[PDB]
Amino acid sequence: QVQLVESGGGLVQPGGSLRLSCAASGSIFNMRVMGWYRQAPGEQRESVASMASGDKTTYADSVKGRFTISRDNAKNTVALQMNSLKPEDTAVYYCHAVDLTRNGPRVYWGQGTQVTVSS
Amino acid sequence: EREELAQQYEAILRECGHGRFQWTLYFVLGLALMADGVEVFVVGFVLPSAEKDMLGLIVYLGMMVGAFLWGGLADRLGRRQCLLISLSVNSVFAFFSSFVQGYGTFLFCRLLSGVGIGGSIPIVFSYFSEFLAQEKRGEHLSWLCMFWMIGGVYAAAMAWAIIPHYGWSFQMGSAYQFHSWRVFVLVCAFPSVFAIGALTTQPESPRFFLENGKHDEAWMVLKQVHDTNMRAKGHPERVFSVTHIYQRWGVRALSLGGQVWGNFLSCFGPEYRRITLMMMGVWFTMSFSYYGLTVWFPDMIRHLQAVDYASRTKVFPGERVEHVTFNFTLENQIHRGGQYFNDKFIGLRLKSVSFEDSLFEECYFEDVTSSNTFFRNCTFINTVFYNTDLFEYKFVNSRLINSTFLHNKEAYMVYFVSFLGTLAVLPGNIVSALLMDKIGRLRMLAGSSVMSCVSCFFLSFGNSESAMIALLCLFGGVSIASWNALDVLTVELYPSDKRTTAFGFLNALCKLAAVLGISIFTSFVGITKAAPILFASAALALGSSLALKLPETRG
Ligand SMILES: *[C@@H]1O[C@H](CO)[C@@H](O[C@@H]2O[C@H](CO)[C@@H](O[C@@H]3O[C@H](CO)[C@@H](O)[C@H](O)[C@@H]3O)[C@H](O)[C@H]2NC(C)=O)[C@H](O)[C@H]1NC(C)=O
Ligand SMILES: CC(C)CCC[C@@H](C)[C@H]1CC[C@H]2[C@@H]3CC=C4C[C@@H](OC(=O)CCC(=O)O)CC[C@]4(C)[C@H]3CC[C@]12C
Ligand SMILES: COCc1nn2c(CN3C[C@@H](CCCC(F)(F)F)CC3=O)c(C(F)(F)F)nc2s1
Ligand SMILES: *[C@@H]1O[C@H](CO)[C@@H](O[C@@H]2O[C@H](CO)[C@@H](O)[C@H](O)[C@H]2NC(C)=O)[C@H](O)[C@H]1NC(C)=O
Ligand SMILES: *[C@@H]1O[C@H](CO)[C@@H](O[C@@H]2O[C@H](CO)[C@@H](O)[C@H](O)[C@H]2NC(C)=O)[C@H](O)[C@H]1NC(C)=O
């Protein structure tokens, strides 16, 4: 078990930004550091983005010019830079970690944080 | 009610001669035929090429309606005017089809464009017939059909150079010129723009004016043609022998419709009924066969390539690999047998690859751009895929437990074959044109039909890749003569009062037969290579049988 840390919820205006920072500690072995997902009222988690491994990234097309990911492995953290926050696009944001250890793949999820939009 | 007017008109035309005007009008109308060919190609071969890498036939159903309507209206309001309206509708709605976002509205706009383009051809041939002398209504009218081939090669080359890919039935967006599909439409429709631009320099057919009643206008047009022909030579400036030869719109629309229906009824009577029924038979059979085979040939090419690839596939029994991390791309078909404990695959691009009876424990996939690859009888256990192209679509039934999908991601040869096919019928014209006045319309038609019938059997002999292209070229080069001969016959038989109406109705029948042929032949592509070889042979046998029962060119 790797302990994950969630943060950064609350109201932000469109044109403003939030830094939602994933962090983890314990049993970390060159892990794929936590990417981001959006949980809606309906049972489902939309992918947002990930910079979890190497210096490369995959962002969802649905978050083009909206959600940017930057990673600092030396810290075991991932920062989601939320921008272009159109008022209807609210969600609970989640950190999704993947364990790449000797016992094979394992995954971890946080409880998520709620982001809403100020106007 | 004797038709001395026709004899006097022919006398004036023969006195006038075949000067520069005939060739100028030949180019102007050839541009319209080019537009027709481009639209036919873009509706039969490019439109259905939009797949998910056939509701594209409703354009034919609009083509038939346009043919009938424009053919009926032309004999009432004029030939030039109906051609202008046809080209204008086609061009405007092609421009509008190049902008729309979505396949449904695109089909609607292309349907409304096919309306006008289908109207084009009957008007073109009836229009150019009235200017040619009775001596050479076969040689020149046959030359006029090279522009259909030029338009076909134009469309094929433009697709082959601009849109060598396909799959845009589901790929579009609010931007412009970002898929290269929205640049094909404009450069396909440019020929129609040129046709409209050029058609304003030509005068209306004198025969329509003489029939309607405005004899002075027909006399003026004939004077214009004589003046241009004589001035072309420069020295001989021969003179012309002058001779005599609100509730307000609903009623008018009903009147015009009633006149058109009277023209259509006149086609079937104590005279012209037998001729028209024979014509319907020949046209239906010919168009059915040609369109069906032209669509079946590239499809058979593709299926033969698929069979070759299927037979070019090999696999070896897989073993148990610890962190195989096979970071190279694979093109082998199968990898039957798999244990793969602690797999570490990363950044591998599978095409045509399958895993059967394989096992995966603590496996990890980083990034796979899999395409056409599926998993069968795969017992995943504790597997994480991270970024992959794997979905239920690309994943066949198999046992999966504790499997997670964290993230997920979203022509070149049909055109070449069709280009060769349409470029291979040019010899057929360059032989038909110089022999139809010498040999004969009826007998050339019969010979061409029987030659197409014999080549139908040959269609199947060439199961090799090259023989198929060879036989497509042969079939086109053989059937073009039949098409030219029947065009000359149809224009010669019906008089100016019902020529365009009859030709347009037979064009509508030919388009309906094209729909039926495409449907039926693509229904059984690769079924013992006999259905398209028996049905086509029977249809062309009926065509040849009927071709020997038509009235002579004087009728
Ligand atoms: C994926 O793997 C995990 C762990 O290997 C599975 O979790 C186990 O699921 C079973 C139900 O199939 C549950 O077993 C429970 O374990 C307690 C432990 O005290 C025991 O009293 C009972 O046997 C009880 O049924 C439980 O959810 C969990 N057990 C453990 C020890 O982790 C999981 O089921 C696997 N995924 C799937 C889809 O089965
Ligand atoms: C460039 C080539 C490969 C195009 C192929 C088209 C064929 C369908 C054409 C080419 C030569 C044509 C033939 C040339 C001459 C004749 C003889 C003709 O009867 C005569 O005896 C004509 C004599 C004359 O009046 O000069 C009957 C039609 C037929 C078989 C023609 C039928 C149609 C043919 C086979
Ligand atoms: C709608 O049917 C009334 C007529 N249409 N039509 C056409 C227009 N064509 C040509 C056909 C193929 C010609 C060459 C090939 F036979 F080898 F394939 C396909 C088509 O639609 C011509 C033309 F082009 F030859 F001048 N003559 C007539 S009559
Ligand atoms: C893909 O695998 C190849 C082969 O294992 C890797 O190439 C090796 O790189 C190492 C470390 O520098 C060398 O010691 C070897 O000589 C290389 N072997 C070969 C066969 O070239 C390569 O780095 C791997 N690439 C990726 C993207 O993982
Ligand atoms: C799916 O694959 C499994 C094995 O991967 C097949 O089950 C095996 O059947 C052989 C038969 O000789 C047994 O010896 C093995 O012990 C079986 N293994 C397991 C895990 O059951 C199964 O028959 C395959 N099913 C299909 C439809 O292909």
PDB file of N, CA and C in Angstrom, chain B residues 55-90:
ATOM      1  N   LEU B  55     -24.941   3.676 -48.161  1.00  0.00           N
ATOM      2  CA  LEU B  55     -25.979   4.674 -48.375  1.00  0.00           C
ATOM      3  C   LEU B  55     -25.536   5.790 -49.309  1.00  0.00           C
ATOM      4  N   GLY B  56     -24.462   5.582 -50.064  1.00  0.00           N
ATOM      5  CA  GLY B  56     -24.007   6.538 -51.047  1.00  0.00           C
ATOM      6  C   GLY B  56     -24.658   6.412 -52.403  1.00  0.00           C
ATOM      7  N   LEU B  57     -25.633   5.516 -52.551  1.00  0.00           N
ATOM      8  CA  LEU B  57     -26.301   5.302 -53.826  1.00  0.00           C
ATOM      9  C   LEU B  57     -27.568   6.132 -53.989  1.00  0.00           C
ATOM     10  N   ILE B  58     -28.031   6.813 -52.936  1.00  0.00           N
ATOM     11  CA  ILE B  58     -29.180   7.699 -53.084  1.00  0.00           C
ATOM     12  C   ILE B  58     -28.859   8.837 -54.037  1.00  0.00           C
ATOM     13  N   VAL B  59     -27.574   9.151 -54.211  1.00  0.00           N
ATOM     14  CA  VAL B  59     -27.191  10.147 -55.202  1.00  0.00           C
ATOM     15  C   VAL B  59     -27.626   9.700 -56.591  1.00  0.00           C
ATOM     16  N   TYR B  60     -27.535   8.398 -56.878  1.00  0.00           N
ATOM     17  CA  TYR B  60     -28.053   7.886 -58.147  1.00  0.00           C
ATOM     18  C   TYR B  60     -29.560   8.085 -58.245  1.00  0.00           C
ATOM     19  N   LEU B  61     -30.273   7.879 -57.139  1.00  0.00           N
ATOM     20  CA  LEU B  61     -31.715   8.072 -57.154  1.00  0.00           C
ATOM     21  C   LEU B  61     -32.075   9.529 -57.414  1.00  0.00           C
ATOM     22  N   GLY B  62     -31.240  10.464 -56.958  1.00  0.00           N
ATOM     23  CA  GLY B  62     -31.436  11.857 -57.330  1.00  0.00           C
ATOM     24  C   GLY B  62     -31.023  12.147 -58.758  1.00  0.00           C
ATOM     25  N   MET B  63     -29.998  11.444 -59.241  1.00  0.00           N
ATOM     26  CA  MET B  63     -29.543  11.581 -60.618  1.00  0.00           C
ATOM     27  C   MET B  63     -30.656  11.241 -61.591  1.00  0.00           C
ATOM     28  N   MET B  64     -31.381  10.159 -61.317  1.00  0.00           N
ATOM     29  CA  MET B  64     -32.465   9.754 -62.208  1.00  0.00           C
ATOM     30  C   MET B  64     -33.569  10.806 -62.246  1.00  0.00           C
ATOM     31  N   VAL B  65     -33.940  11.342 -61.082  1.00  0.00           N
ATOM     32  CA  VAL B  65     -34.978  12.367 -61.037  1.00  0.00           C
ATOM     33  C   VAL B  65     -34.529  13.603 -61.798  1.00  0.00           C
ATOM     34  N   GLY B  66     -33.277  14.010 -61.604  1.00  0.00           N
ATOM     35  CA  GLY B  66     -32.765  15.150 -62.341  1.00  0.00           C
ATOM     36  C   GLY B  66     -32.766  14.914 -63.837  1.00  0.00           C
ATOM     37  N   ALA B  67     -32.344  13.724 -64.261  1.00  0.00           N
ATOM     38  CA  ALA B  67     -32.352  13.406 -65.682  1.00  0.00           C
ATOM     39  C   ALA B  67     -33.750  13.559 -66.254  1.00  0.00           C
ATOM     40  N   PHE B  68     -34.736  12.926 -65.620  1.00  0.00           N
ATOM     41  CA  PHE B  68     -36.101  13.010 -66.128  1.00  0.00           C
ATOM     42  C   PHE B  68     -36.581  14.457 -66.172  1.00  0.00           C
ATOM     43  N   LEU B  69     -36.404  15.195 -65.074  1.00  0.00           N
ATOM     44  CA  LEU B  69     -36.963  16.541 -64.989  1.00  0.00           C
ATOM     45  C   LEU B  69     -36.325  17.470 -66.013  1.00  0.00           C
ATOM     46  N   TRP B  70     -34.991  17.500 -66.064  1.00  0.00           N
ATOM     47  CA  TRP B  70     -34.319  18.391 -67.003  1.00  0.00           C
ATOM     48  C   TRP B  70     -34.592  17.981 -68.442  1.00  0.00           C
ATOM     49  N   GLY B  71     -34.631  16.679 -68.725  1.00  0.00           N
ATOM     50  CA  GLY B  71     -34.958  16.249 -70.068  1.00  0.00           C
ATOM     51  C   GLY B  71     -36.345  16.689 -70.491  1.00  0.00           C
ATOM     52  N   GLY B  72     -37.315  16.588 -69.584  1.00  0.00           N
ATOM     53  CA  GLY B  72     -38.656  17.035 -69.908  1.00  0.00           C
ATOM     54  C   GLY B  72     -38.741  18.535 -70.103  1.00  0.00           C
ATOM     55  N   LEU B  73     -38.052  19.300 -69.254  1.00  0.00           N
ATOM     56  CA  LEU B  73     -38.153  20.753 -69.321  1.00  0.00           C
ATOM     57  C   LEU B  73     -37.379  21.337 -70.493  1.00  0.00           C
ATOM     58  N   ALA B  74     -36.350  20.638 -70.975  1.00  0.00           N
ATOM     59  CA  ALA B  74     -35.488  21.222 -71.994  1.00  0.00           C
ATOM     60  C   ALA B  74     -36.251  21.495 -73.279  1.00  0.00           C
ATOM     61  N   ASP B  75     -37.087  20.551 -73.707  1.00  0.00           N
ATOM     62  CA  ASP B  75     -37.841  20.726 -74.941  1.00  0.00           C
ATOM     63  C   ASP B  75     -38.901  21.808 -74.828  1.00  0.00           C
ATOM     64  N   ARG B  76     -39.174  22.297 -73.621  1.00  0.00           N
ATOM     65  CA  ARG B  76     -40.150  23.355 -73.405  1.00  0.00           C
ATOM     66  C   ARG B  76     -39.504  24.725 -73.261  1.00  0.00           C
ATOM     67  N   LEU B  77     -38.478  24.839 -72.421  1.00  0.00           N
ATOM     68  CA  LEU B  77     -37.850  26.122 -72.150  1.00  0.00           C
ATOM     69  C   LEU B  77     -36.502  26.295 -72.831  1.00  0.00           C
ATOM     70  N   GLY B  78     -35.969  25.256 -73.467  1.00  0.00           N
ATOM     71  CA  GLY B  78     -34.715  25.371 -74.184  1.00  0.00           C
ATOM     72  C   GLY B  78     -33.674  24.380 -73.717  1.00  0.00           C
ATOM     73  N   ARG B  79     -32.666  24.140 -74.553  1.00  0.00           N
ATOM     74  CA  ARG B  79     -31.582  23.231 -74.208  1.00  0.00           C
ATOM     75  C   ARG B  79     -30.464  23.932 -73.448  1.00  0.00           C
ATOM     76  N   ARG B  80     -30.034  25.097 -73.929  1.00  0.00           N
ATOM     77  CA  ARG B  80     -28.984  25.841 -73.247  1.00  0.00           C
ATOM     78  C   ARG B  80     -29.402  26.216 -71.833  1.00  0.00           C
ATOM     79  N   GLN B  81     -30.644  26.671 -71.661  1.00  0.00           N
ATOM     80  CA  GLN B  81     -31.080  27.123 -70.346  1.00  0.00           C
ATOM     81  C   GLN B  81     -31.117  25.971 -69.350  1.00  0.00           C
ATOM     82  N   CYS B  82     -31.619  24.813 -69.772  1.00  0.00           N
ATOM     83  CA  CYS B  82     -31.663  23.669 -68.870  1.00  0.00           C
ATOM     84  C   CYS B  82     -30.261  23.177 -68.538  1.00  0.00           C
ATOM     85  N   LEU B  83     -29.347  23.198 -69.510  1.00  0.00           N
ATOM     86  CA  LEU B  83     -27.966  22.837 -69.200  1.00  0.00           C
ATOM     87  C   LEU B  83     -27.358  23.809 -68.193  1.00  0.00           C
ATOM     88  N   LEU B  84     -27.621  25.109 -68.362  1.00  0.00           N
ATOM     89  CA  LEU B  84     -27.111  26.098 -67.416  1.00  0.00           C
ATOM     90  C   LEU B  84     -27.646  25.834 -66.017  1.00  0.00           C
ATOM     91  N   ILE B  85     -28.950  25.578 -65.901  1.00  0.00           N
ATOM     92  CA  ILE B  85     -29.534  25.325 -64.585  1.00  0.00           C
ATOM     93  C   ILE B  85     -28.936  24.067 -63.973  1.00  0.00           C
ATOM     94  N   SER B  86     -28.777  23.014 -64.775  1.00  0.00           N
ATOM     95  CA  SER B  86     -28.212  21.773 -64.261  1.00  0.00           C
ATOM     96  C   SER B  86     -26.816  22.002 -63.701  1.00  0.00           C
ATOM     97  N   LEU B  87     -25.944  22.614 -64.500  1.00  0.00           N
ATOM     98  CA  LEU B  87     -24.581  22.840 -64.046  1.00  0.00           C
ATOM     99  C   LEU B  87     -24.555  23.764 -62.840  1.00  0.00           C
ATOM    100  N   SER B  88     -25.432  24.768 -62.813  1.00  0.00           N
ATOM    101  CA  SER B  88     -25.431  25.713 -61.705  1.00  0.00           C
ATOM    102  C   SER B  88     -25.811  25.024 -60.407  1.00  0.00           C
ATOM    103  N   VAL B  89     -26.869  24.216 -60.439  1.00  0.00           N
ATOM    104  CA  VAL B  89     -27.278  23.496 -59.240  1.00  0.00           C
ATOM    105  C   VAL B  89     -26.156  22.578 -58.778  1.00  0.00           C
ATOM    106  N   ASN B  90     -25.575  21.819 -59.711  1.00  0.00           N
ATOM    107  CA  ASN B  90     -24.517  20.891 -59.329  1.00  0.00           C
ATOM    108  C   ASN B  90     -23.345  21.628 -58.695  1.00  0.00           C
TER     109      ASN B  90
END
